[PDB]
Amino acid sequence: PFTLPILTLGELTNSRFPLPIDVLYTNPNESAIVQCQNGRCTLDGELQGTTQLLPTGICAFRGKVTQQVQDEHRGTHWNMTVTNLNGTPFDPTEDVPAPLGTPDFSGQIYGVISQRNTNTGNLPANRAHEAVIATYSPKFTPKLGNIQFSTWETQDVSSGQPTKFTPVGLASVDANSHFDQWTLPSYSGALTLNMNLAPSVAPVFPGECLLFFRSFIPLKGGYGNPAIDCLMPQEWVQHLYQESAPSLSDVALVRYVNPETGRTLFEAKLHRNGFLTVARNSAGPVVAPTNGYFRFDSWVNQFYTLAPM
Amino acid sequence: KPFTLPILTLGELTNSRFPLPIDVLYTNPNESAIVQCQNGRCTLDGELQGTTQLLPTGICAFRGKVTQQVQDEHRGTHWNMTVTNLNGTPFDPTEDVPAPLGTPDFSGQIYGVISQRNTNTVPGNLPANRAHEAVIATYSPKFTPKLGNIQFSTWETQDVSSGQPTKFTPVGLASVDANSHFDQWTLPSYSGALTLNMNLAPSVAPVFPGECLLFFRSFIPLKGGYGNPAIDCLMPQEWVQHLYQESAPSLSDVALVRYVNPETGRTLFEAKLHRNGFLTVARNSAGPVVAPTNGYFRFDSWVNQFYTLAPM
Ligand SMILES: C[C@H](CCC(=O)NCCS(=O)(=O)O)[C@H]1CC[C@H]2[C@@H]3[C@H](O)C[C@@H]4C[C@H](O)CC[C@]4(C)[C@H]3CC[C@]12C
Ligand SMILES: C[C@H](CCC(=O)NCCS(=O)(=O)O)[C@H]1CC[C@H]2[C@@H]3[C@H](O)C[C@@H]4C[C@H](O)CC[C@]4(C)[C@H]3CC[C@]12C
Numbered sequence: 001p002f003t004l005p006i007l008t009l010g011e012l013t014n015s016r017f018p019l020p021i022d023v024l025y026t027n028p029n030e031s032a033i034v035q036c037q038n039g040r041c042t043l044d045g046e047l048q049g050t051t052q053l054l055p056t057g058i059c060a061f062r063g064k065v066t067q068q069v070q071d072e073h074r075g076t077h078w079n080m081t082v083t084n085l086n087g088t089p090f091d092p093t094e095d096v097p098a099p100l101g102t103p104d105f106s107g108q109i110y111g112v113i114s115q116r117n118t119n120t121g122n123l124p125a126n127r128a129h130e131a132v133i134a135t136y137s138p139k140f141t142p143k144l145g146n147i148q149f150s151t152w153e154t155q156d157v158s159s160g161q162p163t164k165f166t167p168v169g170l171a172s173v174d175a176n177s178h179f180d181q182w183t184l185p186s187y188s189g190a191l192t193l194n195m196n197l198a199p200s201v202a203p204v205f206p207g208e209c210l211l212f213f214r215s216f217i218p219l220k221g222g223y224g225n226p227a228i229d230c231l232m233p234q235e236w237v238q239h240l241y242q243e244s245a246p247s248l249s250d251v252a253l254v255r256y257v258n259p260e261t262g263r264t265l266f267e268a269k270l271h272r273n274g275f276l277t278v279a280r281n282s283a284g285p286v287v288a289p290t291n292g293y294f295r296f297d298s299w300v301n302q303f304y305t306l307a308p309m
Numbered sequence: 310k311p312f313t314l315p316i317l318t319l320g321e322l323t324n325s326r327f328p329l330p331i332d333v334l335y336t337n338p339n340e341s342a343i344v345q346c347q348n349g350r351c352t353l354d355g356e357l358q359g360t361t362q363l364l365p366t367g368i369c370a371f372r373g374k375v376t377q378q379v380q381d382e383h384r385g386t387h388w389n390m391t392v393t394n395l396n397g398t399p400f401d402p403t404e405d406v407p408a409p410l411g412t413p414d415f416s417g418q419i420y421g422v423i424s425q426r427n428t429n430t431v432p433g434n435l436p437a438n439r440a441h442e443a444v445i446a447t448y449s450p451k452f453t454p455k456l457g458n459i460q461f462s463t464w465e466t467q468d469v470s471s472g473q474p475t476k477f478t479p480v481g482l483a484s485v486d487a488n489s490h491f492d493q494w495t496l497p498s499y500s501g502a503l504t505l506n507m508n509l510a511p512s513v514a515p516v517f518p519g520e521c522l523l524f525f526r527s528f529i530p531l532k533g534g535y536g537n538p539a540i541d542c543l544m545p546q547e548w549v550q551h552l553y554q555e556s557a558p559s560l561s562d563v564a565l566v567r568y569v570n571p572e573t574g575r576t577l578f579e580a581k582l583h584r585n586g587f588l589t590v591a592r593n594s595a596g597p598v599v600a601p602t603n604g605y606f607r608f609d610s611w612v613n614q615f616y617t618l619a620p621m
Contacts (some may be wrong), residue, residue: 011363020367054322056365057330086320112442112481116530123537124535128420128531130422168440168481214425218422219426220440221440243314264593268575
């Protein structure tokens, strides 16, 4: 039978960046097409886009620095090949948009590049430094098997050594930072066409809007309070993958219940492609008690009318 | 409610004691230290223990507020931080826990990023932000998370703000040299040097001749220096999360599990999954387990403590 995990909002993590879920969120007057590639899983357990199971793999990279690269842009820049997260070489011919875990939004992603040398008191040398990956840059070509990152450090990155990127937040969200959580990177480089994408999601029913699991993302500096909205938390991805339960219809009716009072706070539609919609006519957070969680009710047809929240 | 494990390969598992993928299974029979880690602790019927919590983002993380810069005879720039619970609520030191859930459970110089987003906004009515590399020495007398405050240090000498919401994102270790005090089995003194740790998850050990603990091992990054340090957890975070969800009653003290190659259909070895949440194997060898990448543990039966494991 179909189930959802029993996890409160404070027990869920974002599927699009390594962050706890802070709040549920709606934005009906959203202009952009929602087509994120991480946190994408059908209700019958099929992963899509760049989605993989590891919380540690979201917006992470594994590979090897090849060389420093000279550029007209400020900073120190480095090219690294990218493998799959499990160390195997990335096959650019696989039907995926990019290596699984690749960031799915435009921005200056801030984190830590770390290296542990292959050569060896028979111990290998190590180094780690703050770094930024500009996913909108023409040098961001993960589908081709390589990317560029930049550092404040000017010299202390080694060529030919195993390299890991741990994401932490964003470098900036100012006017020149290109942050847009709904603009996909061009995974094959500048002016290229993405392929093998998880489909876009939209509410079709009148008065319905997408319901998001929202996390606020740290900044290296500057002003802003940026957020990342995912369609389903990573634990739901992991759960749906394990269960692979037959979808008895295209829409699951779920209720967001308060365990203290037993009362249903609101109901939503959980769609077969892995997203939620609610009947709500306003934008902003959902101010719900901390212990609330979604409970599966039943399968319904597409023409079911949600009670307004 | 029957007991189950998730079907996940090692490349689909993450460490429960530091935010890292599982790299290899691992034994160290000649281990002399007492094994009593506090993260990644869960009974087979789903009771979280120690400082264990469910969020992979909460492991070795902190939330709170920098109170002030402080002095220290050691070089660097030093900051005092109050710590709350990870969800932002104030930590209640009377709660029957060793420390705020997610607190690191080992001695070392934990390397990460401290980030801040100010409470006050600036009329486009947006708050200011900063982030810097930081190190938390869990062995320091100033590491008192059970008392609701800790100390971290930065290379950065100035750009850390007092009284503002502060987050610590762990990345790895600063050093594992001789003066770095790295020992994954030595607990922090959660309340300081004159106080006993309380509400601990119990120590684990094989109670059977020829058996040793089996760990899920992750290699942990280093800011610099030499070494190949690793963190061994008793069960991956996904097992903690699964056991908690299922809450299946334990029908004996030992669940027999087999590690299975789903391609060759073969059992590579068997292990005891103990009620307190750890594995043992009959292995005289130390070091990694060479097992195919598609393998995973399968629950086979409830047995007792006298079951003799097939040697691996
Ligand atoms: C190379 C990157 C932009 C590339 C680019 O093509 N920009 C223009 C966009 S477009 O091609 O016109 O689409 C820039 C964007 C943000 C930059 C970083 C951030 O500004 C933060 C850092 C600032 C320091 O002065 C230098 C290092 C530091 C870490 C920078 C390195 C270079 C980065 C990573
Ligand atoms: C204050 C910390 C040790 C506290 C301490 O009690 N040490 C002695 C051991 S005990 O008191 O006997 O337990 C030390 C340990 C490691 C140090 C850090 C690391 O060495 C890395 C950094 C090195 C830079 O030169 C300064 C900043 C930098 C980030 C250091 C700041 C101070 C730290 C964090």
